[PDB]
Amino acid sequence: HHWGYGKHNGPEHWHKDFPIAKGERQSPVDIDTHTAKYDPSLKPLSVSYDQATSLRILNNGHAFNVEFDDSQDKAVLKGGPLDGTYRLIQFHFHWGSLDGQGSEHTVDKKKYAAELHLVHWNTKYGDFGKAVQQPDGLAVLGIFLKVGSAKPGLQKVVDVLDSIKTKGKSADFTNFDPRGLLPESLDYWTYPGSLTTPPLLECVTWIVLKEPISVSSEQVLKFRKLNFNGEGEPEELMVDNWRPAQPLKNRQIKASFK
Numbered sequence: 001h002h003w004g005y006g007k008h009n010g011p012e013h014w015h016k017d018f019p020i021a022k023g024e025r026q027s028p029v030d031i032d033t034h035t036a037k038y039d040p041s042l043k044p045l046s047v048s049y050d051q052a053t054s055l056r057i058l059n060n061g062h063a064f065n066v067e068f069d070d071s072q073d074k075a076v077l078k079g080g081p082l083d084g085t086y087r088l089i090q091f092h093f094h095w096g097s098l099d100g101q102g103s104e105h106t107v108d109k110k111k112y113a114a115e116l117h118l119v120h121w122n123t124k125y126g127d128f129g130k131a132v133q134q135p136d137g138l139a140v141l142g143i144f145l146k147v148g149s150a151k152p153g154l155q156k157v158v159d160v161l162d163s164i165k166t167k168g169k170s171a172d173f174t175n176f177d178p179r180g181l182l183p184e185s186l187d188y189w190t191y192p193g194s195l196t197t198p199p200l201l202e203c204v205t206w207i208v209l210k211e212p213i214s215v216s217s218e219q220v221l222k223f224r225k226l227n228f229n230g231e232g233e234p235e236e237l238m239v240d241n242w243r244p245a246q247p248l249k250n251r252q253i254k255a256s257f258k
């Protein structure tokens with residue numbers, strides 16, 4: 001009886017195995033745009049993905065993960081609210097059963113169709129396993145998806161999903177350029193939070209871009225054809241793999257922009 005997103009094992013149950021679920025810096029949150037304070041001391045984000053080397057794509061039973069070779073200093077996030085350098089390890093998405101839900105963060109209670117998470121670890125902790133034990137261990141770059149025009153840079157991902165339909169399936173996925181998933185603007189909100197799935201560790205500096213990317217209805221429909229279950233198990237479509245907004249508590253959301 002492992003955690004997931006259903007009625008019996010979903011977000012409202014997670015606290016039993018992971019009591020930090022009710023902690024002081026949980027994610028996601030609602031971003032109230034009028035209360036977020038412009039912080040002129042925040043620096044522009046530096047996203048350096050020119051040398052990113054993707055290796056593989058995996059259905060882990062909760063999402064699909066595009067994993068990168070992080071053996072060298074290549075694909076790095078720095079600047080913004082961050083001290084030091086954070087290395088890209090993987091990205092994944094959260095999405096809905098319908099276009100009207102799917103994002104984890106919300107903006108003035110607006111839910112987007114999906115949300116992309118590019119996950120980076122602080123190089124001062126040597127590897128990602130050690131980094132998640134630290135309050136400044138990870139930086140997750142969150143990007144909203146709305147349904148409209150297709151995102152051409154997403155299509156290589158969409159097309160490989162047929163080969164990883166079920167939990168535990170992986171596929172080689174080299175030479176994928178994550179620059180193709182970024183919006184024009186790097187204006188962002190930022191706050192201290194957590195992983196949004198178990199183990200819910202309070203190790204994330206969140207950086208959520210204001211500008212969504214547009215993806216086509218057909219692109220997101222293909223996400224919704226994946227399965228939470230393993231091959232030969234009862235079919236459970238991989239939809240609504242999002243955690244709802246959690247209490248902000250004693251936190252401030254800061255805006256990089258006026």
Ligand SMILES: CC(=O)[C@H]1CC[C@H]2[C@@H]3CC[C@@H]4C[C@H](OS(N)(=O)=O)CC[C@]4(C)[C@H]3CC[C@]12C
Binds near residue numbers: 194199
């Ligand atoms: C406990 C542990 O080993 C950590 C190290 C890296 C973490 C992973 C980093 C990448 C994503 C981040 C993701 O958090 S999120 N949704 O806020 O971006 C939770 C799942 C997973 C697989 C994480 C689960 C817990 C992992 C395996």
Ligand SMILES: [Zn+2]
Binds near residue numbers: 092093094117196
């Ligand atoms: Zn995520």
